[PDB]
């Protein structure tokens, strides 16, 4: 995306196109949360064993 | 569709571009605001 501050991305652009960069910051932060939950859960099986 | 709101008006060709979602201008500020969730199709016709 063009920026990492959310209200920042918004406070400049047009909301027909300002809404499309912020959902890229959603699934960028979501897929890093998908990797963190998965790395905790393979480590959950290791600490349980 | 259920119901249509037909908004008909006449304007000069200089300010005919501002009838758009997410636009700022002469008509788009204080005269006729159009929202971002708009569904429909607008038409233009020159009447010189």
Curated annotation (Swiss-Prot), chain A:
General function of this protein: Subunit of the fusion protein that is processed upon entry into the host cell. Mediates fusion of the virion and cellular membranes by functioning as a class I viral fusion protein. Contains a viral fusion peptide that is unmasked after S2 cleavage. This cleavage can occur at the cell membrane by host TMPRSS2 or during endocytosis by host CSTL. In either case, this triggers an extensive and irreversible conformational change that leads to fusion of the viral envelope with the cellular cytoplasmic membrane, releasing viral genomic RNA into the host cell cytoplasm.
Protein name: Spike protein S2'
Organism from which the protein derives: Severe acute respiratory syndrome coronavirus 2
From-to range in the entire protein, with total length: 972 to 1020 of 1273
């Amino acid at each position: 995306a063009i920026s990492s501050v959310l209200n920042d991305i918004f406070s400049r652009l047009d909301p027909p196109e300002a809404e499309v960069q912020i959902d890229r910051l959603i699934t960028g932060r979501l897929q890093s949360l998908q990797t963190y939950v998965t790395q905790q859960l393979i480590r959950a099986a290791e600490i349980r064993a | 569709f259920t119901n249509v709101y037909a908004d008909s008006f006449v304007i000069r060709g200089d300010e005919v571009r501002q009838i758009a979602p997410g636009q700022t201008g002469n008509i788009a500020d204080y005269n006729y605001k159009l929202p971002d969730d708009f569904t429909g199709c607008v038409i233009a016709w020159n009447s010189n």
